[PDB]
């Protein structure tokens, strides 16, 4: 189909609209820029390679470049691979970029550069130099950046990339950068706010530095500023997961009461981890447009009960007061100032880490008349006692979050404690259902109906990671008549009663994954036929339950479309010679997707496929140790579309796939032990659209197995990490791979000859077998 094989080890994409030729060589194990990059390339990404220098030769012909991404070709030792350390910093020879008259964006992060590269073109709007060794900014080195709008200089001096001195910035270094909108000097060991800064700035990042004091002039001229982040200067270091040095004399970051007066356009102020003890109202006199305020990880426990500053914040949308607790103090109650009633526009309130014993309805009264309140997050508070019925006055909320508490009768997992949650790297949920109460990771042992009195509006309840060891019998959730989603994962469900959960008449999704406990002990009655009573259930997750026994022999539903049954013991239930459970799933009449991966199914007894429900479309048998498979039995699965046999020990494919299924579109066989294909494997398999044979032991593929009238209809064919022998017997396959339009990933990287000797480790895409045609 193609007249010229694509030999370039980079993906190449078009956007004729925007006149773009996108060349992506990310992580291609390159040690030189590859020859034959298109002359018309506009976007060239060389991120995560080992190219040791840049020169006028590098981009010679490439005069139409608007963006070079040359990140992490020499990462700082502590940030980078320890098995392939960069021996010496990127060397940039003079005149490498001056040619590139259209260059708009240059990322040179993670290259251990010692200086801001000179001779940059005046077209440059974005320069990124994070994670280098540049720790002295001189005005002279910035004259080249006349038209720069975005400048990232952070991570040049911190614990993962130390420079062992204070950061230096010359007086007025940035002032003549008259179009500069975004300046980031984070994670840099900076000691003072650099002045004077250009009045064009909209975003200023100075977080995770060693700034002890703001001078009252520091932000005088910054009347277009919309985002200011001063977090992590005088950090709160308790339980820090990074080396954390507090300001001496236990000082806060010292901010004069009028420091923000010029900042009339400010929308986001981040004062996280500044050891603040008070928030002066005077801070907010001349900002009424502030929408986001982060005051997490300070010492503001007393202030929260006072908080007059809140009176000045009527347009505030998000407020974070998390982790403000006084060390070794466990308060009886939460004490919110009445001032919270003045946050008319508030949508998100987060107060984790206040640390208190009992939540009472009255303590939340100041929020009662906030009409736009959508999220109330009281996670990680060691709350022992909360009458959940108080949330009847919060029907308007989307999320009520009490996760990680001590109650008994998404932000990243590291959010409040991580050093820099916006760090760029260089290694290679039920809310949508409506109102959600998150009681995950609490100490709830026993539940009953009255616990949920007045909460019938709830659409999602998260009970994940509690201690519920109850024989649920369908009387425990009686008020929750509108619940569509129940997360009961990581409890100890005792499924004695086939009536469990039946009172949840609106339930569409039930997760009882990781409730293995009672399934582990012999002689205990379990009723897996409990699905019969759940009349509108669409999806059931029963993963990692260690299920090896069941009192009932069949599960029935007229609604269920998805069953996840991974991490059980169907191998035990279907022990060879025991026919009793071979119809376990047969009566799930509307089931379209069944995951029975990780069931130790080293073989499938006869009867399993005949026992499958009739509309089954997607079947996973992945990670079962399957050593054999009677392909002809797929004839029983008349609606089968996707079969996943990945990570098994299969050694063969069927003589004729066409004869095993009329319907099969997507066949996943990756990570098996297949050494060759059958002579007529895919002949007449016209319905096939996706075939994964990667990570097998295939040596040879011939046209009889892989007819072109089937291959050329595939959306993807995965062939990498096989054992291809590149002899004259391989001429057809090599020609066909070189010349096909069918998508085949990792050609540049992992579609390799293993022999014979001449060709060992050679990419098949580059292979020249002219000697076979002499």
Ligand X SMILES: *[C@@H]1O[C@H](CO)[C@@H](O)[C@H](O)[C@H]1NC(C)=O
Ligand Y SMILES: *[C@@H]1O[C@H](CO)[C@@H](O[C@@H]2O[C@H](CO)[C@@H](O)[C@H](O)[C@H]2NC(C)=O)[C@H](O)[C@H]1NC(C)=O
474 binds ligand X (CB under 6 A): yes
249 binds ligand 23G (CB under 6 A): no
- Count Cβ atoms within 10 A of the Cβ of residue 248 and give its class: 0-12 exposed, 13-18 middle, 19 or more buried: exposed
What CA–CA distance (Å, rounded) separates 635 from 659? 8
404 binds ligand 23G (CB under 6 A): no
639 binds ligand X (CB under 6 A): no
121 binds ligand X (CB under 6 A): no
Judged by DSSP in three states, 668 sits in strand
570 phi/psi in degrees, rounded to 5: -55, -30
Instruction: Identify what 157 binds: a copy of itself, ligand X, ligand Y, none; CB under 5 to 8 Å per kind.
Output: ligand Y
Q: How many residues bind ligand Y (CB under 6 A)?
A: 9
659 phi/psi in degrees, rounded to 5: -80, -10
165 binds a copy of itself (CB under 8 A): no
Shortest spacing between CB 490 and a copy of itself, in angstroms: 9
Residue 127: CB atoms within 10 A of its CB come to 22
487 binds ligand X (CB under 6 A): yes
Rank residues 96 and 209 by Cβ distance to ligand Y and give the closer one: 209
Please report, as residue ranges, which positions from 581 to 600 form the binding site for ligand X (by CB under 6 A): 592-593
What CA–CA distance (Å, rounded) separates 629 from 609? 11
166 binds ligand Y (CB under 6 A): yes
499 binds ligand X (CB under 6 A): yes
Token pair, residue 577, equals: 């010679």
What CA–CA distance (Å, rounded) separates 206 from 190? 8
What CA–CA distance (Å, rounded) separates 597 from 80? 35
Instruction: Identify what 156 binds: ligand Y, ligand X, a copy of itself, none; CB under 5 to 8 Å per kind.
Output: none
Shortest spacing between CB 304 and ligand X, in angstroms: 8
355 binds ligand 23G (CB under 6 A): yes
628 binds a copy of itself (CB under 8 A): yes
Pairing label, strands 20-24, 11-15: antiparallel
Is 438 labelled as part of a ligand binding site?
A: no
- What track of x and - describes contact with ligand 23G for positions 438 through 477 (by CB under 6 A)? ---------------------------------x------
Strand ranges for 162-275 from DSSP E: 168-169, 182-184, 203-205, 227-229, 268-270
Of 130-138, 235-243, 385-393, 762-770: span binding ligand X (CB under 6 A): 385-393
Q: Using CB under 6 A, pick the residue from 165, 257, 716, 728 that binds ligand Y.
A: 165
Q: Using CB under 6 A, pick the residue from 26, 159, 223, 605 that binds ligand Y.
A: 159
Rank residues 67 and 187 by Cβ distance to ligand X and give the closer one: 67
Rank residues 112 and 568 by Cβ distance to ligand Y and give the closer one: 112
Rank residues 35 and 577 by Cβ distance to a copy of itself and give the closer one: 577
496 binds ligand 23G (CB under 6 A): yes
Q: Using CB under 6 A, pick the residue from 49, 59, 67, 339 that binds ligand X.
A: 67
How many residues would you count in the chain?
Answer: 774
Rank residues 264 and 389 by Cβ distance to ligand X and give the closer one: 389
Q: How many residues bind ligand X (CB under 6 A)?
A: 46
Give per-residue burial for 141-150: e unless 16+ CB within 10 Å, then b. bbebbeebbb
Distance of CA 594 to the CA centre of its chain: 25
Query: Of the candidates 699, 694, 696, 693, which has an alpha carbon nearest to the alpha carbon of residue 726?
Result: 699
Judged by DSSP in three states, 143 sits in helix
The answer to whether the CB of 519 falls within 8 A of the CB of 554 is no
Rank residues 270 and 352 by Cβ distance to a copy of itself and give the closer one: 352
The answer to whether the CB of 223 falls within 8 A of the CB of 263 is yes
- Count Cβ atoms within 10 A of the Cβ of residue 349 and give its class: 0-12 exposed, 13-18 middle, 19 or more buried: buried
Shortest spacing between CB 304 and ligand 23G, in angstroms: 16
C-alpha angle 764-769-774 in degrees, rounded to nearest 5: 175
Q: What is the SS3 assignment for 414-474?
A: CCCCCCCCCCCCCCCCCHHHCCEEECCCCCCCCCCHHHHCCCCCCCEEECCCCCCCCCCCC
The answer to whether the CB of 723 falls within 8 A of the CB of 761 is no
510 phi/psi in degrees, rounded to 5: -130, 125
The answer to whether the CB of 45 falls within 8 A of the CB of 26 is yes
Is 724 labelled as part of a ligand binding site?
A: no
Q: Which residues are annotated as a binding site for Ca(2+)?
A: 768
Residues found near ligand Y in the complex (CB under 6 A): 157-159, 162-166, 189
Residues found near a copy of itself in the complex (CB under 8 A): 77-79, 81-83, 159-162, 239, 241-243, 323, 352-353, 380, 404, 406, 408, 413-417, 441, 443, 445, 465, 467, 469, 492, 517, 520-525, 548-549, 551, 572, 575-580, 602-603, 627-628, 649
Residues found near ligand 23G in the complex (CB under 6 A): 327-328, 330, 355, 382, 406, 471, 494, 496, 523-525
Residues found near ligand X in the complex (CB under 6 A): 20, 22, 43, 66-67, 104-105, 302, 305-306, 335, 387, 389, 392, 403, 429-430, 438, 440-441, 453-454, 462, 464-465, 473-475, 485, 487, 498-499, 527, 529, 532-533, 551-552, 592-593, 617-618, 635, 642, 659, 666
């Amino acid at each position: 189909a193609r007249w010229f094989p694509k030999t370039l080890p980079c993906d190449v994409t078009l956007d004729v609209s925007k006149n773009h030729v996108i060349v992506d060589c990310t992580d291609k194990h390159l040690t030189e820029i590859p020859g034959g990059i298109p002359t018309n390339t506009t976007n060239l990404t060389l991120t995560i390679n080992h190219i040791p220098d840049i020169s006028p030769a590098s981009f010679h012909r490439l005069v139409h470049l608007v963006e070079i991404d040359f990140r992490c070709n020499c990462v700082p030792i502590r940030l980078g691979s320890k098995s392939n350390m960069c021996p010496r910093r990127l060397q940039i020879k003079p005149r490498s970029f001056s040619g590139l008259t259209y260059l708009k964006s240059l990322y040179l992060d993670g290259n251990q550069l010692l200086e801001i590269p000179q001779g940059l073109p005046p077209s440059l709007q974005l320069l990124s130099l994070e994670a280098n060794n540049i720790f002295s900014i001189r005005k002279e080195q910035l004259t080249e950046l006349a038209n720069i709008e975005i400048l990232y200089l952070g991570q040049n001096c911190y614990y993962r990339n130390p420079c062992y001195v204070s950061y230096s910035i010359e007086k007025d270094a940035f002032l003549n950068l008259t179009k500069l909108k975004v300046l980031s000097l984070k994670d840099n060991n900076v000691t003072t706010v650099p002045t004077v800064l250009p009045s064009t700035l909209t975003e200023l990042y100075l977080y995770n530095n060693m700034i002890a004091e703001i001078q009252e002039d520091d932000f005088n001229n910054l009347n277009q500023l919309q985002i200011l982040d001063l977090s992590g200067n005088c950090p709160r270091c308790y339980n820090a997961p990074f080396p954390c040095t507090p300001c001496k004399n236990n000082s806060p970051l010292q901010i004069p009461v009028n420091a923000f007066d010029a900042l009339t356009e400010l929308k986001v102020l981040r004062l996280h981890s500044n050891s603040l003890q008070h928030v002066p109202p005077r801070w907010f006199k001349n900002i009424n447009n502030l929408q986001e305020l982060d005051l997490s990880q300070n010492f503001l426990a007393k202030e929260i009960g006072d908080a007059k500053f809140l009176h000045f914040l009527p347009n505030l949308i998000q407020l974070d007061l998390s982790f403000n607790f006084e060390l070794q103090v466990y308060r009886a109650s939460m004490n919110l100032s009445q001032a919270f009633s003045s946050l008319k526009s508030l949508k998100i309130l987060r107060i984790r880490g206040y640390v208190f014993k009992e939540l009472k309805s009255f303590q939340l009264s100041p929020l009662h008349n906030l009409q736009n309140l959508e999220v109330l997050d009281l996670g990680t508070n060691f709350i022992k006692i909360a009458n959940l019925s108080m949330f009847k006055q919060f029907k308007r909320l989307k999320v009520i979050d009490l996760s990680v508490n001590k109650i008994s009768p998404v932000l990243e997992q590291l959010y409040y404690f991580r050093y820099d949650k916006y760090a760029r790297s260089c290694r290679f949920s039920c809310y949508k259902y409506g109102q959600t109460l998150d009681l995950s990771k609490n100490s709830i042992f026993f539940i009953k109906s009255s616990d949920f009195q007045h909460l019938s509006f709830l659409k999602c309840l998260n009970l994940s990671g509690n201690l519920i060891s109850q024989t649920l019998n369908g009387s425990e959730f009686q008020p929750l008549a509108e619940l569509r989603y129940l997360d009961f994962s990581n409890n100890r469900l005792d499924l004695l009663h086939s009536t469990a959960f039946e009172e949840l008449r609106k339930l569409e999704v039930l997760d009882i994954s990781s409730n293995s406990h009672y399934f582990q002990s012999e002689g205990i009655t379990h009723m897996l036929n409990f699905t019969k009573n759940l009349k509108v259930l669409q999806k059931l997750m029963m993963n990692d339950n260690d299920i090896s026994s069941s009192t009932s022999r069949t599960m029935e539903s007229e609604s269920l479309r998805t069953l996840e049954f991974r991490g059980n013991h169907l191998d035990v239930l279907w022990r060879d010679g025991d026919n009793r459970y071979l119809q376990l799933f047969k009566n799930l009449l509307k089931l379209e997707e069944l995951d029975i991966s990780k069931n130790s199914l080293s073989f499938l007894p006869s009867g399993v496929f005949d026992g499958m429900p009739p509309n089954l479309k997607n079947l996973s048998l992945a990670k079962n140790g399957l050593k054999s498979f009677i392909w002809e039995k797929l004839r029983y699965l008349k609606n089968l579309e996707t079969l996943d046999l990945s990570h098994n020990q299969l050694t063969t494919v069927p003589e004729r796939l066409s004869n095993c299924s009329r319907s099969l579109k997507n066949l996943i066989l990756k990570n098996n032990q297949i050494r060759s294909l059958t002579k007529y494997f895919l002949q007449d398999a016209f319905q096939l659209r996706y075939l994964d044979l990667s990570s097998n032991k295939i040596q040879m593929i011939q046209k009889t197995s892989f007819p072109e009238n089937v291959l050329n209809n595939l959306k993807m064919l995965l062939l990498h990490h096989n054992r291809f022998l590149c002899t004259c017997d391989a001429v057809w396959f090599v020609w066909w791979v070189q010349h096909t339009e069918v998508t085949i990933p990792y050609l540049a990287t992992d579609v390799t000859c293993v022999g014979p000797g001449a060709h060992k480790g050679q990419s098949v895409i580059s292979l020249d077998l002219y000697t076979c045609e002499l």
